[PDB]
Write a structure and sequence with these properties.
This protein is an all-beta fold. It is about 0% helix and about 50% strand. The strands form four sheets. Strands 1, 4, 5, 8, 9, 10 and 13 form a seven-stranded antiparallel beta sheet that branches. Strands 2-3 form a two-stranded antiparallel sheet. Strands 6-7 form a two-stranded antiparallel ribbon. A hairpin with a 7-residue loop joins strand 4 and strand 5. The radius of gyration is 14 Å and the shape is globular. The protein binds magnesium ion (MG) (4 copies) and sodium ion. The chain binds one DNA strand through strand 1 and strand 9. It comes from Homo sapiens (Human).
DNA sequence: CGTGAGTTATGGGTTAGAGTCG
């Protein structure tokens, strides 16, 4: 059906801050969480890879990688934590169930939203005292600020 | 450093137009 093809990395080493000034950080080895940080060196740094679709998608599709690693952000289902998936190289071709690696990246001003290609009404979301999850919206926080050049 | 008339559209350059590329 729909196929996604990797173009290139379009953003290196950025930080995601939610609307509450909380940065995404590593929770353990599997998950991410969010926390208010004084020192942004504890914040995860991300790379963003752009994909084209085989059809005229409305919003650009991206993959999110933890910078200087082989760990890619992967969606599960609603209210479940995103998973860090280890991969030898960035996937050149994505279709079928592997679209859980991909997100539509939309901006509303300075606000950035990442919706699962596998679940287009679910967002990367932070929730107090819990891991970064897929969520439909409030009370979860779904709008992020992108802090660039944070290597 | 990235193709080949496509999703040609774009937040963007990748957007022209078959020819560079090592
Ligand atoms: Mg998580
Ligand atoms: Mg494609
Ligand atoms: Mg997804
Ligand atoms: Mg989001
Ligand atoms: Na489009």
């Amino acid at each position: 059906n729909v196929k996604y093809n990797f173009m290139r990395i379009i953003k290196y080493e950025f930080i995601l801050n939610d609307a509450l000034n909380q940065s995404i950080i590593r929770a353990n080895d599997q998950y991410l969480t969010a926390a208010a940080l004084h020192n942004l060196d504890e914040a995860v740094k991300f790379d963003m890879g752009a994909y084209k679709s085989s059809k005229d998608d409305a919003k650009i599709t991206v993959i999110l990688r933890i910078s200087k690693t082989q760990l890619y952000v992967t969606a599960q289902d609603e209210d479940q934590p995103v998973l860090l998936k280890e991969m030898p190289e960035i996937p050149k071709t994505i279709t079928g169930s592997e679209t859980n690696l991909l997100f539509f990246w939309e901006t509303h001003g300075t606000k950035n939203y990442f919706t699962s290609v596998a679940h287009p009404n679910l967002f990367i979301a932070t929730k107090q005292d819990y891991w970064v999850c897929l969520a439909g919206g409030p009370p979860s926080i779904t709008d992020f600020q992108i802090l660039e050049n944070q290597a």
